[PDB]
Amino acid sequence: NLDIIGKRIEKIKQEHETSWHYDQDHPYKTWAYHGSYETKQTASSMVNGVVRLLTKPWDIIPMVTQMAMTFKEKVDTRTQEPKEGTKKLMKITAEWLWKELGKKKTPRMCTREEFTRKVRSNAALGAIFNKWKSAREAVEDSGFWELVDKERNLHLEGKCETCVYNMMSRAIWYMWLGARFLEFEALGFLNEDHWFSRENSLSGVEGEGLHKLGYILRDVSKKEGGAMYADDTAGWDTRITLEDLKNEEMVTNHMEGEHKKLAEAIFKLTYQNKVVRVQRPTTVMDIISRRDQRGSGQVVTYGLNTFTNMEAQLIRQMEGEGVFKSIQHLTVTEEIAVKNWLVRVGRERLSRMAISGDDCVVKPLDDRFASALTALNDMGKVRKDIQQWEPSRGWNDWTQVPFCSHHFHELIMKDGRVLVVPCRNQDELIGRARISQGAGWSLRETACLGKSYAQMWSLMYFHRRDLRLAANAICSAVPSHWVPTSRTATHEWMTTEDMLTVWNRVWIQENPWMEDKTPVESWEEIPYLGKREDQWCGSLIGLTSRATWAKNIQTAINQVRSLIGNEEYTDYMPSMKRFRR
Numbered sequence: 078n079l080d081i082i083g084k085r086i087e088k089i090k091q092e093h094e095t096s097w098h099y100d101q102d103h104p105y106k107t108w109a110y111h112g113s114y115e116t117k118q119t120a121s122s123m124v125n126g127v128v129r130l131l132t133k134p135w136d137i138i139p140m141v142t143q144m145a146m147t148f149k150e151k152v153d154t155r156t157q158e159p160k161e162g163t164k165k166l167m168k169i170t171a172e173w174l175w176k177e178l179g180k181k182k183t184p185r186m187c188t189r190e191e192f193t194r195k196v197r198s199n200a201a202l203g204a205i206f207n208k209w210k211s212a213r214e215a216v217e218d219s220g221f222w223e224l225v226d227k228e229r230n231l232h233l234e235g236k237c238e239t240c241v242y243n244m245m246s247r248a249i250w251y252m253w254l255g256a257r258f259l260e261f262e263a264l265g266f267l268n269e270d271h272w273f274s275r276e277n278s279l280s281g282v283e284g285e286g287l288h289k290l291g292y293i294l295r296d297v298s299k300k301e302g303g304a305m306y307a308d309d310t311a312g313w314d315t316r317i318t319l320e321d322l323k324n325e326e327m328v329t330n331h332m333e334g335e336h337k338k339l340a341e342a343i344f345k346l347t348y349q350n351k352v353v354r355v356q357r358p359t360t361v362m363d364i365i366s367r368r369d370q371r372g373s374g375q376v377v378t379y380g381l382n383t384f385t386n387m388e389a390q391l392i393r394q395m396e397g398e399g400v401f402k403s404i405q406h407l408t409v410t411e412e413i414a415v416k417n418w419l420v421r422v423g424r425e426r427l428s429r430m431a432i433s434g435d436d437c438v439v440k441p442l443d444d445r446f447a448s449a450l451t452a453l454n455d456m457g458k459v460r461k462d463i464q465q466w467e468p469s470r471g472w473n474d475w476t477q478v479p480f481c482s483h484h485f486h487e488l489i490m491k492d493g494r495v496l497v498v499p500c501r502n503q504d505e506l507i508g509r510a511r512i513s514q515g516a517g518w519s520l521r522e523t524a525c526l527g528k529s530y531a532q533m534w535s536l537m538y539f540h541r542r543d544l545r546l547a548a549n550a551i552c553s554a555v556p557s558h559w560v561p562t563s564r565t566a567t568h569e570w571m572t573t574e575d576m577l578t579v580w581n582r583v584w585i586q587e588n589p590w591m592e593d594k595t596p597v598e599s600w601e602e603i604p605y606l607g608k609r610e611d612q613w614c615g616s617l618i619g620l621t622s623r624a625t626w627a628k629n630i631q632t633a634i635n636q637v638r639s640l641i642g643n644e645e646y647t648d649y650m651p652s653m654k655r656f657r658r
């Protein structure tokens with residue numbers, strides 16, 4: 078208890094001994110409170126004027142315009158401890174899953190060179206403000222790596238001093254760059270070495286890309302079985318138990334030497350015991366503590382979410398197939414039956430799933446899965462927006478299944494070849510592209526972020542009439558040689574390569590579901606959804622506002638070119654039939 082966290086607490090107390098006080102009216106219930114101190118400050122969501130000026134029809138669509146405007150009483154709930162039968166099911170399953178994931182991989186420590194290369198191209202790692210300005214500065218300075226060195230040797234000594242979370246259905250738990258390095262050093266291999274790739278994990282999709290997720294769902298659909306289930310969990314990160322953290326920690330059983338010691342420390346001292354500083358208006362800073370729930374950096378969180386979700390869904394599959402009878406207790410022969418199931422058909426059962434962190438699609442052996450709820454609820458993974466004991470509603474058509482905020486269309490090219498393409502409501506796509514994050518964006522940086530969205534649209538959403546037209550307009554309106562940016566799925570659109578060449582590489586050449594490798598020699602060979610399907614998915618095609626926008630597009634492009642000024646521009650609009658004489 079306070080042996081593990083006291084050092085961190087004591088140290089913060091001493092840096093604000095002018096301010097410390099055990100406030101009487103603290104709202105914390107399931108979090109342990111410890112004390113308070115004075116600060117005062119927070120950033121918010123800003124509009125990208127380049128994208129907004131080139132999407133005028135959406136200026137009167139509330140779903141688009143309201144996205145730019147703007148429960149922490151879910152983080153302060155409790156989760157009951159699972160029954161002994163559930164704990165046994167999770168231990169056997171976790172044990173077996175780490176061995177499967179380990180068969181063709183070697184756990185290993187990640188390098189400062191790898192961490193530096195991360196900072197020096199802006200990954201979302203989750204640092205905080207006072208000694209150095211940016212991450213890029215602290216990395217390049219020897220004094221930083223000295224503070225790292227101190228903390229590191231405390232971790233090998235089985236102690237912690239500076240590894241503290243700053244809180245803010247989200248809740249990003251930022252740490253100082255230092256504690257982020259130590260997390261990445263110990264557990265970075267899970268992401269860096271693709272442990273949850275589809276090849277390695279069979280259920281996972283890590284690194285597959287939005288242009289492969291539809292093909293993966295269609296391959297699951299080919300399995301003999303029942304409906305496709307895609308039940309979301311209510312607040313997955315808040316439902317991670319101590320039993321889940323212990324089963325995740327068993328990855329250390331496959332490690333050795335310093336790496337093993339460094340990993341056991343991250344699990345024991347920063348994951349299964351945490352220290353958090355939370356801002357409160359009544360503006361003070363509350364040091365609070367907890368043992369359960371997910372508080373890692375967001376890349377390790379993805380990997381351990383995927384692991385624990387794969388485990389949870391194999392157990393729900395076991396329940397549907399009648400492998401065990403009751404969560405209360407597992408008989409000795411039930412243990413053997415569960416081991417024999419895992420070892421005999423476990424790999425086949427993983428291949429009937431697509432799992433991306435807390436998000437899943439399962440095509441089970443049959444529809445007994447739908448009412449197999451006892452283990453899932455008792456593991457605390459309670460389904461969102463359905464009564465606790467109401468059977469799951471499955472999907473009969475893989476093209477209706479939601480996964481990673483999308484659905485997927487089958488799209489026949491004029492030449493008969495078949496594309497499986499990602500899609501979501503077009504108001505969501507346009508609303509997002511109209512938003513920037515943070516202060517001090519130049520016009521140039523704003524234009525380059527617009528261009529990132531435009532190239533993503535050309536590559537992923539080419540089949541939506543409004544997005545191909547808007548993407549061509551943004552790329553005409555931004556100087557042709559300016560490089561797409563973003564301050565924080567493989568990102569093939571982040572390039573100054575010609576987008577038709579990239580389309581051909583992604584959808585034809587490197588596409589394992591495309592046998593005929595004949596290139597496309599124009600955008601006009603690349604199809605759209607049916608006009609009615611485009612409208613169902615949110616197209617404005619058929620509206621007068623949209624007709625005027627399309628007809629007068631060069632006037633909008635010219636308005637943005639006039640603001641940016643005298644630069645080298647390209648006209649991409651004649652790549653579309655209707656602007657080509």
Ligand SMILES: NS(=O)(=O)c1cnc2cccnn12
Nearest residue numbers: 107154155156157158368369
């Ligand atoms: N609030 S909790 O879900 O972390 C929880 C469940 N059972 C216990 C027993 C002691 C402390 N906490 N606890």
Ligand SMILES: NS(=O)(=O)c1cnc2cccnn12
Nearest residue numbers: 185186187188189190191262
């Ligand atoms: N400081 S470090 O994390 O780069 C490091 C130290 N020792 C090793 C061994 C393998 C990889 N990295 N590594």
Ligand SMILES: NS(=O)(=O)c1cnc2cccnn12
Nearest residue numbers: 156157158318319320368369
């Ligand atoms: N992880 S849990 O919610 O199942 C749980 C059960 N019993 C305790 C005691 C302290 C913290 N968490 N906890």
Ligand SMILES: [Cl-]
Nearest residue numbers: 472473474477
């Ligand atoms: Cl359906």
Ligand SMILES: [Zn+2]
Nearest residue numbers: 237238239240
């Ligand atoms: Zn630490």
Ligand SMILES: [Zn+2]
Nearest residue numbers: 486500501614
């Ligand atoms: Zn659609």
